[PDB]
Amino acid sequence: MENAHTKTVEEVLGHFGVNESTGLSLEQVKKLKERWGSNELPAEEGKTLLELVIEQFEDLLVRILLLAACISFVLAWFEEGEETITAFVEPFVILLILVANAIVGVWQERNAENAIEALKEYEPEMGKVYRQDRKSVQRIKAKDIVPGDIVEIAVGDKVPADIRLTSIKSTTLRVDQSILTGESVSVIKHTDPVPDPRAVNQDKKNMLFSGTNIAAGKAMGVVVATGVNTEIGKIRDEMVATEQERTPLQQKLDEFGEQLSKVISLICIAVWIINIGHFNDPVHGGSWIRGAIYYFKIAVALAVAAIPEGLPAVITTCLALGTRRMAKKNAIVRSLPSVETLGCTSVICSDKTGTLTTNQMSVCRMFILDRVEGDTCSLNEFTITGSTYAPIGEVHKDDKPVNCHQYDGLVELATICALCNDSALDYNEAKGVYEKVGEATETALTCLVEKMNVFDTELKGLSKIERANACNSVIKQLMKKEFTLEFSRDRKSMSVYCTPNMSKMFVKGAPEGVIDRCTHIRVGSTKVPMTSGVKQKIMSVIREWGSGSDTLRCLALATHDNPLRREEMHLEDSANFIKYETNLTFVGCVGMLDPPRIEVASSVKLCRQAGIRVIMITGDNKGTAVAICRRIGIFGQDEDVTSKAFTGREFDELNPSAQRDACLNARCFARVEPSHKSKIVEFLQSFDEITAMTGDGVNDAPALKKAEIGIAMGSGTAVAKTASEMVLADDNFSTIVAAVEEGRAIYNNMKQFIRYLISSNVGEVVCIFLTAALGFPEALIPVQLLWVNLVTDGLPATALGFNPPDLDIMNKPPRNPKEPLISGWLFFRYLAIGCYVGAATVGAAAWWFIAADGGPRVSFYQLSHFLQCKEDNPDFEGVDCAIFESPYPMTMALSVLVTIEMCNALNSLSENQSLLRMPPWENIWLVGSICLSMSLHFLILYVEPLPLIFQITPLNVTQWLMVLKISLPVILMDETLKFVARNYGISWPFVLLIMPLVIWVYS
């Protein structure tokens, strides 16, 4: 059935061959079940571990590490011996690191997926269908419903499938469509057909879409769509069809990996070129194509040694710690790199109903008659706190808490509110929240009566389930509730007959429609003749409440003291209801709205400080949307919103330049379709802006998946939590701001341990290449370089992730999405450091061979030509040949490298802040990890079996002083670089602590 809302009830009944009185037969049931199938959405679940690891290995850095591992493995295989375990130890540990990284990623993904399934009420879905089996209604599962079934639905049940309304058993039918359309107020439904074929879901007032629940009434209709043919099913298909890009952090890491691969391949071909033509010698060869094999084998090994190994491990550790700190704030993050996304977010789009506001109408204002002076009056006004259905808030007259017992008008108002409504407020122990039973605009009055204790009952001893309806129960016990005159659209009010345990008729309705019938005023306990001045004053106050800064749904409450008895009452016709209440006594009025969350007003301001633009994209009308915008702080109370607030059509009828100016300056989009939100998010991203979308409904699912990060509310639909990358399990909007902080800190710290590692490694390159150029004996060998790069470069690089965040971190605009991790300057700035690690280490070794007392004081010629020392005495008159394999210079080089790395982790605490102004004890984890790395290095020296694995031997005090002399100037070098970076001794205890070391070392 196509466009069932455009066709009358008779023809849509005949198209399916179903009679509204009888229903469907089991034959037709099976005939439709075999075609359409089950009425449920296809479940998409997390993939197996293998397909998760496949995407864990999608990072370019992990691919580079795996390529380097395979290369070093096929290079270690050139040796005929298969038992060379010292050569295969490097690819094995690289593979272990990569496998651990992938396992941690998969574990985080699975833990996040499991934490979101707990935010799902395990409720069975049922429906009431009229089939030809039995005459009475049949309660069956909604999965078995097929297009054509007659479905009967009453107040308080979810709509099982798309239903074309055939008959309304009650006078009116009110449905809550906040899930699909985002409307805060319930919609009145009618069986009349809608002429527009391409009408939006809000214009379809004869259809009941799936997932929505009935607020009030009872009706019967015909199913027209099931499964994926429903509206929510179409929205889920549109969500699944949307594309999913890579997070900004993943893009930055891919760019850095491309730069790294360009660097690694550069030094390889450079060494190959500078060493080509150097194998024309006959030694171990004799050809040119054969000469490019040994030099290639050494150059590729050098280039692989240039690559950092613990970088993805420390990145994953930092991201996982960030995810843990966010989950401690009730925020479920699916992916690791999504923790940084809110740090670089420029625009935060947000749904209104349920996301920015609660979905729980609450009375926030009220007023009664305090005094009367003649042709005028005085209005006693109160404001009530509380933005949910929980009866916890308080009432304040002007600014101070007051008791409503002294006021008789407030007692009458509470009586009217508790007796005129037919809704209720229950408590769900499973979710621990209070919920409504009927319409929201009557649960508001129920919670109001529960808030203002007019009888001063004691609710402290009562439990939560009894505290939900205690005061209403007391008021109902005091006055018995007789028949209720049904609400009529012409009279625009509803009344209730009441006889105490004389007769009073309590009327509740629209302000003007009710006040046009009130002829007297209740002031305290006194009846007073009504005049035009009182009327115009009350009407002006209502118009002030009904619009302006506070757009409130207003409700007038009156009483009838002398009504005619039920004997003279005639309830056959609806038109007698208004004439039965021609004379009324105005008691007061109340004003309720869909209140924003209590954490949104400060959150929009904090996001404004951090440079984030908040946009509201909602399906509700522009009135309520702009009201909530002015309330939370997006707009001002008097700010013109002519070119800052749009609708769906008002945005569609704009030219591309107009749409550009809108997306660049608008802040409120109202009455938008689920595809309109995706269009807005796509435009905001087309303007090169990392976009964040927050939502709780199905209509947000196509948008939450389009944004770089999509945040869903913990109470929202399952589709929204499916399309989202973050989930606020506690419906706390302020948490988002907190998240924006972490993604700002983490990334900063990230850059730190991306430099401190990278620079370190290039040092171990300049140490080797120079040793190949000068011809000196090998100072640093890969077996100890692996231990360095892992242990003494992962503990400081991990502790550098705990750096204290900046003081103005949340006071600056988001970072430019175009700038890379390693800039030009920060490139040079590390090259220098790398060079210093190349010149020092080698030098240290040479020192032990030239100037050390214990070492053989050979000449530079004898040092560079140690290959000729194998001969007895060509030029080496007394020096030993075995001494060129001594472990003392190798230990000197290793200790110098480790000490330079410790000092470089020391002065890597901040990018530009000097070590004097920011002492190292600011990050106690950094100094702790430095102590641990030095302790593990000394462990390598003085334990029994490990000094045999690494060709190193312990030192003495003089050689350690020399190591310090060689290594410490790296701090001066980095301080000079930081000074140059800033321009183009605040901590005096640190200075007086380091002066002994400097004077003792350079004594």
Ligand code: BEF
């Ligand atoms: F829930 Be939103 F206002 F579409």
Ligand SMILES: [Mg+2]
């Ligand atoms: Mg919503």
